[PDB]
């Protein structure tokens, strides 16, 4: 199994620097060409940078839009590829995927992405409140409950339920930017009403840029 795992994303001021990392397994890392490809609502999918094999001088190539600001590097002894970004701009905000390109053809494997936000606003961790079920959230044999994840910056937050054991019926809504400049979202789940008070429900909120990892038990 090929796995690519990125890390290092987060919030940085305009003009700032930030280094992303990616660790690969499942193929002979030193024989292959590692890439960074970013995605944003405005510009879609955008190849950023590639570093080729040590055998051909570890040659680096960059998109014109980051040339002179980004440096891609690799550490074959760690199966790691790195993207050093400098002089960052608001328009560099987006999701940055680690990706293998097969000798100049397909991007045949991709990581999960790590999120970069270029902004002058500050990091703020979320408050987590329960969305408690009662009868006014009981539609027959189905009940709804959830977690409200309020007043955080930047994106993203992840929410899982019962440490990932509960996935069916889960809806984690896209965040909304509030007039305060902070984000807020809710994650909900529909469960059999008979399981209220007999099964435990815990939302696992993680907001990496503020080191927030909160588990909230949601009770009737």
């Amino acid at each position: 199994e090929v796995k690519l795992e990125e890390s290092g994303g987060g919030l940085v001021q305009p003009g700032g620097s930030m280094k992303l990392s990616c660790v690969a397994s499942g193929f002979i890392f030193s024989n292959h060409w590692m890439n960074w490809v970013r995605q944003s609502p405005e510009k879609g999918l955008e190849w950023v940078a590639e570093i080729r094999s040590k055998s051909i001088n570890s040659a680096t190539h960059y998109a014109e839009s980051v040339k002179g600001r980004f440096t891609i590097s690799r550490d074959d002894s760690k199966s790691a590829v790195y993207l050093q970004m400098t002089d960052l701009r608001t328009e560099d905000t987006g999701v940055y995927y680690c990706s293998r390109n097969y000798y100049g053809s397909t991007y045949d494997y991709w990581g999960q992405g790590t999120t970069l936000t270029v902004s002058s606003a500050s990091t703020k961790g979320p408050s987590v409140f329960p969305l408690a079920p009662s009868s006014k959230s009981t539609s027959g044999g189905t009940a709804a409950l959830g977690c409200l994840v309020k007043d955080y910056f930047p994106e993203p937050v992840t929410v899982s339920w019962n440490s990932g054991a509960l996935t069916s019926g889960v809806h984690t809504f896209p965040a909304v930017l509030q007039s305060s400049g902070l984000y807020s979202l809710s994650s909900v789940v529909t469960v059999p009403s008979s399981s209220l008070g007999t099964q435990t429900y815990i939302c696992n909120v993680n907001h990496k840029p503020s080191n927030t990892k909160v588990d909230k038990k949601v009770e009737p």
């Binding site: 879609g44 190849w47 190539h61 100049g104 045949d108 409140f129 969305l131 809504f173 809710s186």
Partner: protein, 213 residues
Amino acid sequence: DILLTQSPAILSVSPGERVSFSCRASQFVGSSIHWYQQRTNGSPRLLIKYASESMSGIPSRFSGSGSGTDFTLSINTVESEDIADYYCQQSHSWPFTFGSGTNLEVKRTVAAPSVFIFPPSDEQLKSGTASVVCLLNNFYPREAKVQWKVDNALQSGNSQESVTEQDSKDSTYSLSSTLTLSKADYEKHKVYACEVTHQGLSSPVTKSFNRGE
């Protein structure tokens, strides 16, 4: 640089129908067009390389064709799990470029929302703020209307909505509407109601609670 034009950007088809996505290159790209699928909050996944070679593990209903500048990705009988963005990419000439993506919506029968309302938690109320949440779960089509009434007085300017992307398991959408008040304003009223209208409801659906009961 080579521009890949994907048009239409949005396709909506019924389940079991055949759908075709268009990708056109501004310059000759030979057969060097590759297709990817990206589900909501997921990574792009390679489906077809070099115009028409499907990768291993890709279901047989996916196919591709084309050469020169005009390319097609077809799904032969669409199911709900095919709901995703579809992207083409050329590797004929450097730098490699991607199309803007076509979104696939899979139609389904009308489904009225289940509606739920959530009072603000006691924990939040101690901070001076009350969020009231109304959930519209698993409905179709996407269009819905949500009105907040506080002691029968229609609220304005103090709520925000969020909608999920179409669900690849059941082709539905879900919506949240969050009413935010100060603890002061919240405590001044009794009846908090969410009123919901949708094509699938024969009359508006109201969910409500009395503050502190």
